[PDB]
Amino acid sequence: DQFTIRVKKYMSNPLLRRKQFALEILHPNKGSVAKKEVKERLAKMYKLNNVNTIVLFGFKTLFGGGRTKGFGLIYKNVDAVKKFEKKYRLVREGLIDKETKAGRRASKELKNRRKKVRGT
Amino acid sequence: GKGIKKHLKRVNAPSHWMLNKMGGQYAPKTSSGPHKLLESIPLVILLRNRLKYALTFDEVKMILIQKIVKVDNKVRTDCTFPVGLMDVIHITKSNEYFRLLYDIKGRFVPHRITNEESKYKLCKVKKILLRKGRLSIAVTHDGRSIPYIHPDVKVNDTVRLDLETGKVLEHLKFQVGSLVMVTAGHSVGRVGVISSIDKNMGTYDIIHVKDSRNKVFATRLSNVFVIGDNTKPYISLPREKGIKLDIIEERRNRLKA
Amino acid sequence: MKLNISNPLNNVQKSIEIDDEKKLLPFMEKRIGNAVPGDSIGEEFTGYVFRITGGNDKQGFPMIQGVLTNNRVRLLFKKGMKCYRPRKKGERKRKSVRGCIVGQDLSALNLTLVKKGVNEIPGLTDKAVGKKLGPKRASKIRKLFNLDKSDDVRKYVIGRFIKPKIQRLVTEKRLLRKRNLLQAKEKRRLEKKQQLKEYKQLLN
RNA sequence: GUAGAAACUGCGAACGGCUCAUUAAAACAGUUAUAGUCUACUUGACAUUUAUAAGGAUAACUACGGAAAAGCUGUAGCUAAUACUUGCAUUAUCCUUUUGGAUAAGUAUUUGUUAGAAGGAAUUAUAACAAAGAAGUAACACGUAAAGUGUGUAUCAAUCGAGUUUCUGACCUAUCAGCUUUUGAUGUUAGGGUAUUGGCCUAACAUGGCUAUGACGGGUAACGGGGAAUUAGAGUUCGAUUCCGGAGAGGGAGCCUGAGAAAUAGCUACCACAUCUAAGGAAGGCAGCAGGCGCGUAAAUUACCCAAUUCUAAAGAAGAGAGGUAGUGACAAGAAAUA
């Protein structure tokens, strides 16, 4: 297909070794574009040899379609991706797998396991 | 018990922090340090809400863990550290130097400064205390104690301070020609030349300050900061140059674009 | 009734569960720390002397030193009192406790053997147990081994191979930190000298 | 070296959250003072009367146990620590005049005698003399420039705050007109006590203090304010409830630790309730989040998550019914089908 990519309020942030910006995707008369296509388009535009170093979030399709706004981060490398990004975002990217989903039952267990009441 | 409160509600936070109502229920209570909470911003909001470098408090912590940002050429790692009225903030990874200043609308802005200027901070002496041995110490607005100040320095003077050595370089008086910057009033952020000083016995002393365009505004004596002499400000200023404009004619220059 | 006798010298202890009351009759009306001839409790125990060091009453309440009663009493327990484990700093709690006098209420009795008898008891006076772990302080090791300040004792330690670590060593970092502190004091001295010097110069 | 259950130690748990019972010059608000005080974390200054490194004593752990039961714990044996406790240069000044000799040595705090950059005013800062004198000044742990940090420490200052405090401001009621004063009421003097001032308390003394400009009482279905409804302008009514201040944790009272509590998911006792019990004894405080009963005209899920906001810590990495997300939800509010 065909669409247009637009980068707004772009700024490089070496402190997080990131590059922050806002995405506007013009896809008139056609449905919202999957994140893979915008990933490769951004890779071509910014001359990146690898595609797992970006993260995309906050994608909204607006009213009436033909437009989508979102936020993207360009990372120096995958090591920076893992260092400076949260676990849920890494799981979204698929870079890692889900951890244990016990939740507040861990807190319940910790309350049960009063010190010197469980010798182990 | 009824000890010290340790939370700040968002709407109870200082107005110049510019925190939005719906962005959570709490504001970052600045740690105790060089400056008052009311007359300072925590560097978390300095580089999350102003510089937009960080998007979340955790990203602020991410920045701070690496000993990058230095407040007065020394490394700060506390997330809620009060940066204060005027001083230098050096970010080494991006190699940028900021001076914290006030805009004409009474808000804290990081103003770009050169590396050469990032060594010349200004401190407003608030007290002169003589300790044992007739040794004199100047207590400044920075909460900083400078021992062995020059005996000519008075209680409302200002002193240029070298960040590397922590020494005074020169001092600035408060005559009727010394230009000052107002810090906390209706006229917070204005830069003027001091038209007159009225000293009321036992109450606040008032000073009338003349602007560049010859408009006069009065303020309390404790709310001013000597910046330079009549020749020039000793520090650089933001783009407005401390010149406040009537709202009826700010609109015209906003419209013309 | 379940007398727990401890030989601290042999680092060991043994339990004797008895039911006869005339066997323990000489123990009655003896406070904690009293020495008694523990011969009536058994034939093989004739000769030994036992110090009564504690016990628990019928309901399990322990015994203490101060209270000179024969029954249970309640009293406030402080942070330094022996029969109490505070749950937070400065907390005091009122608990029941049994007096130091022994009667026909002790579900258990703690005793330590002070004087050796004439017979041997298997596992009570035959074998001995060591420290189960060696001392950790360098001065303690030096006292144990008697090698003065000759050489490092890091290779004369006790292991299970795997060995503990020694505190209060003579480590080069421990020396250089003291040296650096001395130099810091000195340099602070010179800066406080010539800073007041230049202050005196600028006084005029 | 990498980690590391437990435990000792450190910090926090005095924040937050909830509710509005009490409360009528009280609380609160604006406006002061603290020259009458305390102040953890954090920040800046910066110290005084065996040493190639000092002492016991304890947890965890091991073995023997008791009790129906509990966040119960006895005895014996060892070991650490930034737990507890002892303890090891030097600087300044006078003069011949870069330099030689000479002289002196307590941080706060208290007492007596003196001299005296700032404030509005000092019995101020500070200095001298004569007496006392705490607590300290590292016997502690990791590593940044192609020396640093952490932890701890005396004092001052800053900061986060707090306690008292000045002036002014409140609803109805006189079928409440005289109150207070032995039992402190008003003031003086001396002291005690406090962090500090003060009848705060004690002793002596004096007879004062308030009041029709409403004292003292009574009522409030009264927490105060920011605010809300209704408004042409005046007004009238409301404000339990996002924020701020106050108060309380069934009702009272008392207390420990701590920088900070008269704390309540801290302790002690009484009253009223109320749980377990083998009947000997233990244990409790939802006006926190859900949820239940009751009361009623009258009000939701015994849900998910720390991702955001932010707090605590030994501070990236852990927690947080704070908080957020969803569920119920015709409380209100906005847009908007039935052509």
Note whether B1 contacts C: Cβ–Cβ < 8 A: no
CA dist B249 and A116 (Å) reads 74
Domain assignment present for B225: yes
Where does residue B133 fall: left (phi above 0), alpha (psi -120 to 50 degrees), or beta otherwise?
Answer: left
**Which residue, chain included where needed, has tokens 């200002």?**
B158
Each residue of B239-251: b (16+ CB within 10 Å) or e? eeebbbeeeeeee
Element (H, E) at C185: helix C172-203
Query: 3-class DSSP state for residue C173?
Result: helix
CA angle, residues C91, C96, C99, in degrees to nearest 5:
120
Q: C185: Cβ–Cβ under 8 A, 6 or more apart, which residues?
A: none
Q: What is the DSSP string of chain B?
A: -------EETTTS-GGG---TTS-SEE-PPPSSSS-STT--BHHHIIIIIS---SSHHHHHHHHHSS--EESSSB---TT-B--SS-EEEETTTTEEEEEEE-TTS-EEEEEE-TTGGGEEEEEEEEEEEETTTEEEEEETTS-EEES--TT--TT-EEEEETTTTEEEEEE---TT-EEEE-SSTTTT-EE---EEE--TTSPPEEEEE-TTS-EEEEEGGGEEEEE-SS-BSS---TTTT----HHHHHHHHH--
Q: What does each C-alpha distance from B67 to A82, B61, B71, B86, B92 come to in angstroms?
A: 20, 11, 11, 21, 9
Decide which of C130, C155, C187 is a domain's last residue.
Answer: C130
Q: Can you give the CATH number for the domain in which C195 is found? A: 1.20.5.2650
Question: What SS3 class is residue C172?
Answer: helix
Number of domains, chain A: 1
Retrieve residue B63's tokens.
Answer: 């920045």
Distance CA B210, CA B212 (A): 7
β partners of residue B121:
B161
Cα dist from C191 to B129, B149, C188, C200, C202, whole Å: 21, 16, 5, 14, 16
- Contact call for residues A15 and B68 (beta carbons, < 8 A): yes
Domain extent, residue A45, equals 1-120
Is residue B253 domain-resident? no
Could you tell me if residue B252 is inside a domain? Answer: no
CA–CA gap between residue B193 and residue B200 (Å, rounded)? 21
**Which of residues C109, C130, C151 is at a domain's end?**
C130
Q: How far is CA C198 from CA A103, B123, B124, B196, C8, in A?
A: 66, 21, 22, 36, 71
- Nearest residue of chain A to residue B69 (CA atoms): A15
Q: Give me the CA B218–C1' D168 separation in Å, rounded.
A: 27
Q: Are residues B130 and B58 in the same domain?
A: no
Q: Output b/e per residue, B9-39; b: 16+ Cβ within 10 A.
A: ebeebbebbebeeeeeeebbbbeebbbbbeb
Nearest residue (Cα to C1') for D142? C173
Of C82, C103, C130, the position where a domain reaches its end is C130
Identify the three-state secondary structure at position A106: helix
Reading the block at residue C194, the tokens are 């010539």
**Has residue B251 been placed in a domain?**
no
Please check whether residue C13 is in contact with residue C6, taking contact to mean a CB–CB distance below 8 angstroms.
yes
C69 CB less than 7 Å from any atom of strand D = no
| Residue that has been written with the tokens 């922590």 in this structure | B166
Chain B residues with CB inside 8 Å of A20's CB?
52
Please report, for the domain that includes residue B155, its CATH number.
2.40.50.740
Residue B82 covered by a domain: yes
List the domain range (segments joined by +) for residue C49: 1-130
Rounded-to-integer distance, Cα C43 and Cα C1, Å: 17
In a domain, B254, yes or no: no
Q: Are residues B3 and B85 in the same domain?
A: yes
Long-range contacts of B134-138 (CB under 8 A, 24+ apart): B135/C196
Q: Which of A14, A20, A84 sits opposite B93 (nearest CB)?
A: A14
Calculated CA dihedral for residues B108, B113, B117, B120, nearest 10 degrees: 10
Q: Which of B186, B114, B124 lies closest to B155 in space, CA to CA? A: B124
Domain count for chain C, please give it. Answer: 2
The residues with which A14 forms a beta bridge, in sequence order, are none
Taking phi over 0 as left and psi of -120 to 50 as alpha, with beta for the rest, B143 belongs to: left
Q: Alpha-carbon distance A16 to B64, whole Å?
A: 10
Torsion angle of C-alpha atoms B121, B124, B127, B132, degrees rounded to 10 = 20
Contact A11, A20 (CB under 8 A): yes
CA atoms within 13 A on the CB side of C112: 12
Which tokens in the block code for residue C174?
A: 């421990």
CB contact burial B182-199 (16+ within 10 A = b; e otherwise): bbbbebbbbbbbbbeeee
Residues ending a continuous segment of chain C before a break (C–N > 2.5 Å): 160
Q: Does B139 contact strand D, using a CB cutoff of 7 Å?
A: yes
- As a whole number of angstroms, the distance between CA B231 and CA B199 comes to 26
- Non-local (6+) Cβ contacts of B99 within 8 A are B86, B87, B88, B89, B110, B111, B113, B117, B118, B235, B236
Buried b (16+ CB within 10 A) or exposed e, C145-180: eeeeeeeebeeeeeeeeeeeebeeeeeeeeeeeeee
Give the residue among B29, B32, B26, B69 at the shortest CA–CA distance from B47. Answer: B69
Report the DSSP beta bridge partners of residue A79. none
How far from B177 is each of A107, B193, B217, B226, B228, CA to CA, in Å?
Answer: 67, 6, 15, 10, 9
Whether residues C170 and C138 share a domain: the answer is yes
Please tell me what DSSP assigns to residue C125. Answer: T
DSSP state of C26: G
The reply to whether B147 has its C-beta less than 7 Å from any atom of strand D is yes
Q: How far is residue A51 from each of residues A78, A93, A110, C204, measured CA to CA in Å?
A: 10, 11, 42, 70
If one counts the domains in chain B, the total is 3
Both C119 and C144 in one domain: the answer is: no
CA distance B164 to B82: 20
Q: Which of C99, C112, C90, C40 is CA-nearest to residue C64?
A: C99
Q: How far apart are CA C115 and CA C37, in angstroms?
A: 9
Whole-angstrom distance, CA of residue C52 vs CA of residue C32 = 5
CA–CA dist A48, A70 (Å, integer):
20
Strand, helix or coil at C40? Answer: coil
Other CB atoms within 10 Å distance of the CB of residue A105? 9
Contacts of C199 in chain B (CB under 8 A): 148
The reply to whether B256 falls in a domain is no
Residue B12 and residue B112 in one domain: yes
Query: Could you tell me if residue A22 is left (phi over 0), alpha (psi between -120 and 50 degrees) or otherwise beta?
Result: beta
Question: C110 with C153, same domain?
Answer: no
Q: How many CA atoms lie within 13 A of C176 on its CB side?
A: 3
Indicate the helix (H) or strand (E) that contains C109. strand C108-115
Experimental technique behind these coordinates: cryo-EM
Residues C7 and C108 grouped into a single domain: yes
Give me the CA B185–C1' D19 separation in Å, rounded: 39
Q: Reduced to 3 states, what is the DSSP secondary structure of residue C182?
A: helix
CA distance B111 to B100: 6
Chain D bases near protein CB atoms (7 A cut-off):
5-7, 12-17, 40-47, 52-55, 60-81, 90-92, 107-108, 117-121, 125-127, 138, 140-143, 147-148, 156-163, 242-247, 256-264, 266-269, 280-283, 304-312, 316, 319-324
Assess contact for C68 and C33: CB atoms under 8 A.
no
**With a CB-CB cutoff of 8 Å, which residues 1-60 of chain C face chain B?**
none
Resolution (angstroms) equals 2.3
**CATH code, A88:** 3.30.70.3370
Range of the domain at B148: 121-171
Of B191, B168, B74, the closest CA to residue B122 belongs to B168
Contact assessment for residue B14 and residue B27, using Cβ atoms and an 8 Å cutoff: no
Is A90 within 8 Å of A81 (Cβ atoms)?
yes
Q: Is residue B236 part of a domain?
A: yes
Residue B211, amino acid: D
Q: Which residue, among B119, B128, B126, B113, has the nearest Cα to B167 in the 3D structure?
A: B119
